[PDB]
Amino acid sequence: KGEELFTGVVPILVELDGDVNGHKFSVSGEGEGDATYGKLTLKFISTTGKLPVPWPTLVTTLVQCFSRYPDHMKRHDFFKSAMPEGYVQERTISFKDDGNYKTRAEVKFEGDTLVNRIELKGIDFKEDGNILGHKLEYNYNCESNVYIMADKQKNGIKANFKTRHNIEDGSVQLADHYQQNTPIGDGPVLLPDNHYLSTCSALSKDPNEKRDHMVLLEFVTAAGIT
């Protein structure tokens, strides 16, 4: 039933409240998703405290229901199956040789609009590390595979993946992601066979925007099953 909600272009709202090493910030995003093509277009704006971390480190936290599942894989699409009631998405993101984010989000429809509401908590970051020191390039050079498995005990899914963020000196900052999703509602959901999401992201700037912001274009396709 949920998959029928994604046959067209769907408006998206994203709202994040963050605290990283006591630095508080908030992000608001707007855009749209077209799961027929695995396509996301989103613009995010920082609305309160000076963004204490680099924009690229927030991409994965800031709607996998917009992934394109090939027809032969549609029985493996947990994300759409949980809609409209939605799912909780939780992660631990471990930055190598630095701190960690713990994120808790609720993704669901509010009327015709797909909403992602997030609380992010970061601790153990180094003052002159790549994150608090703002040493990461404004790009997303790595196309990551999100490896998904069923979690039948919790009627949901688990995932793990690595993202690699370019450092301004040419090196790379690794971020290990562990993820758990569970349905909010009491409808049946689809519990998938092992597979992955191939995720390609591109960051840009709005030349007329004076606020601290990030424009994101993303294509996401489910794969790993013939």
Side-chain angles (χ1 to χ4, degrees), residues 6 10-17 26-31 40 42-44 58-66 79 83-91 93 103-118 120 179-181 184 214 216 218:
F6 293 87
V10 175
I12 304 168
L13 301 170
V14 182
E15 293 292 326
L16 176 151
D17 291 313
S26 298
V27 174
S28 292
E30 300 183 20
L40 287 162
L42 291 164
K43 179 179 170 187
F44 303 99
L58 298 180
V59 170
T60 59
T61 299
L62 295 165
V63 292
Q64 293 171 317
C65 50
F66 291 103
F79 306 98
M83 298 294 163
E85 306 90 336
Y87 53 78
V88 173
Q89 175 164 299
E90 297 170 290
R91 298 212 180 92
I93 310 182
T103 66
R104 189 184 188 284
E106 293 200 357
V107 185
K108 69 183 286 197
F109 278 89
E110 297 289 356
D112 69 353
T113 300
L114 187 289
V115 175
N116 182 16
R117 288 182 179 90
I118 314 142
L120 176 155
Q179 176 179 335
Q180 307 185 345
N181 296 234
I184 292 172
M214 167 170 72
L216 173 66
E218 198 161 84

Side-chain angles (χ1 to χ4, degrees), residues 41-49 51-118 120-142 144-148 150-180:
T41 57
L42 291 164
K43 179 179 170 187
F44 303 99
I45 296 161
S46 173
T47 64
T48 58
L51 253 214
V53 303
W55 279 111
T57 73
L58 298 180
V59 170
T60 59
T61 299
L62 295 165
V63 292
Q64 293 171 317
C65 50
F66 291 103
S67 304
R68 184 179 73 79
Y69 274 74
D71 185 72
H72 76 280
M73 292 179 69
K74 285 182 175 187
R75 79 191 167 95
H76 305 294
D77 190 349
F78 165 83
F79 306 98
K80 294 183 190 60
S81 83
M83 298 294 163
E85 306 90 336
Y87 53 78
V88 173
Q89 175 164 299
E90 297 170 290
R91 298 212 180 92
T92 303
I93 310 182
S94 304
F95 294 90
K96 184 177 175 62
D97 297 318
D98 212 334
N100 56 273
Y101 299 164
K102 282 188 169 285
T103 66
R104 189 184 188 284
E106 293 200 357
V107 185
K108 69 183 286 197
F109 278 89
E110 297 289 356
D112 69 353
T113 300
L114 187 289
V115 175
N116 182 16
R117 288 182 179 90
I118 314 142
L120 176 155
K121 187 72 170 290
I123 65 174
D124 297 325
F125 285 90
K126 295 180 192 317
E127 308 314 319
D128 184 48
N130 294 323
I131 290 88
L132 296 178
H134 289 286
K135 309 189 189 186
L136 300 182
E137 298 187 339
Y138 187 75
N139 55 46
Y140 218 87
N141 273 33
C142 95
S144 50
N145 290 342
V146 174
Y147 296 99
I148 294 171
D151 183 353
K152 287 188 274 196
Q153 182 194 61
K154 290 191 62 49
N155 198 40
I157 58 162
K158 287 174 156 151
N160 66 272
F161 54 103
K162 297 173 178 279
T163 63
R164 290 174 180 92
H165 306 285
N166 287 358
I167 303 164
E168 285 179 351
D169 66 359
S171 193
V172 64
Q173 172 67 68
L174 177 65
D176 284 295
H177 293 68
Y178 186 60
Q179 176 179 335
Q180 307 185 345

